[PDB]
Symmetry: D2
Subunit: 317 residues, 4 copies
């Protein structure tokens, strides 16, 4: 039986006997994703080039305006805005959303895969909304996921029921469910990190990657892949297994990716998919943020591969 | 003044006072790319999943049929067919086309970028058309390029007049000229290869990569990127500069990429953009093929980066 | 603030504190309508014509399948099925849907406007669902409307809250609310009927039409428009005012249009839009059907015009 | 074997050993029509309604056609329903063709989403003077090519040349015009008449009697069906596909009719004749009228020949 994203969320919402606010939020978000996808695939570019005589800015506005007008949110955190956005009172709902509206867009001149990442928290207190309502550990996530604008557009949605993958059919503007209850392989064969930074690697990372290239036993060395666009590298890791690393070094003691709207939603998808996600010293989802734009190192993927990393990591501790 | 692909090709054809066959071939090829792109982005996937109750094969069929019916071709070589296809006498024209109808499609389950690669030769001999007509060196290419199905779908077309880039506007199904007479950077800051084969690397490749991670002049190390899809990796190399390497390993002692419809067309685009493409021992375009599916090692990209590799290569004889 | 059809229905439905069955129904129906529009604008026709080497039947299948899999219906009546379809028990909901999946389709060979018409009733008894559950007067409509596949695609939805018009943005596959709580003009300037049956007209129709062409008060005569596709002629009456007639003649004492899935939903849209809808002797919504395909004569549109028709009809006892 | 418009025109051009200017022209026109269709189906309308927090359609259509023709290097004079004067292409972009067009006909009723269309006619420049408005004053007989786009339930391009009439379906999934009807011919006689009967008070007596004959046939045969969309391209295209007769005739208040000869009547008459139909003003063939003003009007009755003849017989009966 065919299933769409909207149909699916509605059916889960009725099972749970909820009020509907989250379904309205997710429906708005889904619509924002279709418009972003359309602009990313360069719909209307002929008009820009004079046939009749901003991509991350538009991305941010699409998500921002669709979430605000959903009547389901009260605080919004974005890669693009220095401060949390507080929804005006008439539109205030009960959810906090952190998002990266177009991750990887810094290299979009080469038409690399890009994506939107989002995380949804229930607002916990009844105080007047403020930036502080976004400083929750990822463990508190109600829902998280990403859309990948790759060879095709896919929406990956993680909730407590698990991880589900939806393909955008552009002929009809619908997300079709194509992977139910996805789980990552226990062990993979691919490692993903920018090896041009080798001069600066923490000694444990240097030893870990060296073992993937030169296994002590007779196993085959791992393949390397690194798109440089997080959503694409994480989705490959999810679909094929393995390990993704953007680790900490002495130049970056807290890593580079932002915890709220990059590391946590990926850590959440990974954990709902049976994988792992650590900073080296703790699970990414247990980190308690103090700044909405603070960074975190992240190592995520297949459990055996992440467990092996932590073993090399503790060897150097 | 705005320009489309078909408009651009027609204007060159009349300047060149030619018969139109290459225009018809190129026009047909362009139609195939729009169908492939439509298919790669999953238009109509909802019907396959039962809303009303293989991708590399289809791409090959679209290209074959559009070329055959162009009346402009006589021999077709495809990554997907063990033998050259001989066009029937009534449809025979004067051109030989080597193409990969969907390169990278082996990893499309993760929505990696994919692309179509093509090279167009004039038939050289006067014998009956046969497989022998495709065994020409890349130096003999009349036209070459690729369609990249990435965040957007872009067509890169290379001829003697230089390199030109056309963006597919999917709202109207037209290729829009967006980059005229492209030239690659003299020196880039990114190197690209699968470093998991390090156990098998040639000493010259090993030394070259170390100089990228640990520069002798203590200048900044290069960034690493490796998508694993040749069209995406080479296109990034063209847009941002740098160097792409797929050298030989123990599983691939003659390298892995195919000379006729992968290495030569990319080498031609690179050279027409002012860049370089070498096997280590000779220019890719100077290799005389003996087998239509034969492999080649290739190092290509910015001239300063490619020369430095060759300087290291000669150090190791 | 921007609104889509699904967001609009969710917000009304939450206001009404309902179970969600109707929203699931309306969303499924929206998905079917987007699919039909894609087929109607001939997406993919290149494949039927051999690029790689039914319409009303497909339309009926799309509606049937989205309705069956919506978990909101139990009885379906279609222009295309002699008998009502009884939803299988595990998919049963409480709603009865009567629809014409592609009316006007016999003349789609000239690319005339076509459309989907639908009316939604709540089920009657709790015994076996059966064909009798569709034999309700139009007065019982819970919701009704149509999609028009014209120069653009528009969905018109009528409920207790009023009539609203949604434009399908084909770039993103969303219905955007563009006309809130719409009302028909009190009096229009266009009459619409097939004047080729004039030899068979009821004397009242003859006198009414003569009054439009040769106005007694020397006002300007009405313009005539008749596309031959009911959804197209009816939408024009809604948008611009005027009167649409498919009257009973000497040959067809109960007219030609079908009461359940053509006349009733248009009368319902007309009444909720401030217009009128008569058979000549009674309000269309007051007719109690006895057979699911029974026909009814219909005169609908701007009230002053329909009253003017009724006044001539009453004169002819 | 599949055929697209761009492929088909290239092939015909190579058979005829032409220079390519007409093919560059038609390809440019073809692109404009895909752009109009996209806007007519309302792509991107969510942005106009604030999904992230420009012009009117007949203005945008005219700019699309104007700009593509100018950049085609194939034109020298452009006449449009929307511009009082002929546009004379700048010397650097000048070609040898004169194009008359209605960029978005029927647009007065596009608010109800009725079918609309683009109409075009292409003449060769005859004289050797510098290009001017006068180079467009040619009879329809001089047409090199003519046709229309119908933006209906699907988008179709009907293109007529000496080789005949061909119909192309736009596949919006890939943006190509697919050949779906080769060498089209109209029925000898139809069953549909098409005109605005709301003007009946003012009909010329020939129109009144002829229409009266369609509703109440003398040989107690079945009456004709009526259709009138009110959009010329939709009504004319239906006449081609199903046969029949289309009338926008002259009355005493409009002795030269309302539709424009250069960019509405002539291109439709040219298609009708190439498909085996007829097109008359009542007194002469539309294609034989010599225009004196680029925006002058003409009466037109066109369609299946047997039906047009019956009209002309009724017309002559009323002298
Ligand atoms: O959406 C609802 N209820 C509904 N009532 C009617 C319709 Br129709 S949907 N509840 S919810 O808390 O938002 C939710 C969404 C998901 Br997915 C969950 Cl799991 S729980
Ligand atoms: O295309 C033509 N001639 C034409 N005449 C009129 C039109 Br319109 S096209 N010749 S060609 O040999 O195919 C060619 C394409 C390119 Br690009 C070249 Cl350089 S040479
Ligand atoms: O839709 C709901 N409930 C919902 N709860 C949460 C979400 Br989210 S939708 N009920 S209904 O009876 O279907 C209905 C549709 C319309 Br439109 C009405 Cl007015 S009432
Ligand atoms: O276009 C050409 N020749 C060509 N040369 C190369 C290519 Br490729 S096409 N001739 S033309 O005069 O424009 C013309 C179009 C039609 Br349709 C005619 Cl009949 S004649």
């Amino acid at each position: 039986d065919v299933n769409t994203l909207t149909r699916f969320v509605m059916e889960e919402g009725r099972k749970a006997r909820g009020t509907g606010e989250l379904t309205q939020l997710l429906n708005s978000l889904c619509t924002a994703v279709k418009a972003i996808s359309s602009a990313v695939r360069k719909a209307g570019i002929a008009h820009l080039y004079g046939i009749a005589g901003k991509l991350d800015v538009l991305s941010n506005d699409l998500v921002m305006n669709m979430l605000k007008s959903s009547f389901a949110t009260c605080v919004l955190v974005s890669e693009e805005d220095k401060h949390a956005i507080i929804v005006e009172p008439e539109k205030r709902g009960k959810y906090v959303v952190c998002f990266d509206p177009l991750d990887g867009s810094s290299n979009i001149d080469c038409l690399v895969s890009v994506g939107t990442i989002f995380g949804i928290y229930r607002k916990k207190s009844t105080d007047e909304p403020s930036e502080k309502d976004a400083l929750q550990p990822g463990r508190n996530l109600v829902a998280a996921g990403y859309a990948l604008y790759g060879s095709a557009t896919m929406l990956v949605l993680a909730m407590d029921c698990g991880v589900n993958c939806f393909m955008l059919d552009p002929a009809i503007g619908e997300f079709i469910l194509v992977d139910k209850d996805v789980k990552i392989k226990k062990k993979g064969k691919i490692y993903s990190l920018n090896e041009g930074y080798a001069k600066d690697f923490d000694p444990a990372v240097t030893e870990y990657i060296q073992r993937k290239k030169f296994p002590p036993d007779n196993s085959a060395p791992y393949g390397a892949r690194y798109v440089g666009s997080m959503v694409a590298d994480v989705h490959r890791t999810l679909v094929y297994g393995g390990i993704f690393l953007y680790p900490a070094n002495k130049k970056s003691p807290n890593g580079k990716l932002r915890l709220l709207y990059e590391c946590n939603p990926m850590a959440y998808v990974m954990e709902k998919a049976g994988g792992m996600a650590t900073t080296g010293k703790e699970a990414v989802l247990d980190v308690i943020p103090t700044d909405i734009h603070q960074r975190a190192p992240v190592i995520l993927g297949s459990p055996d591969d992440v467990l092996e990393f932590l073993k090399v990591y503790e060897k150097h501790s």
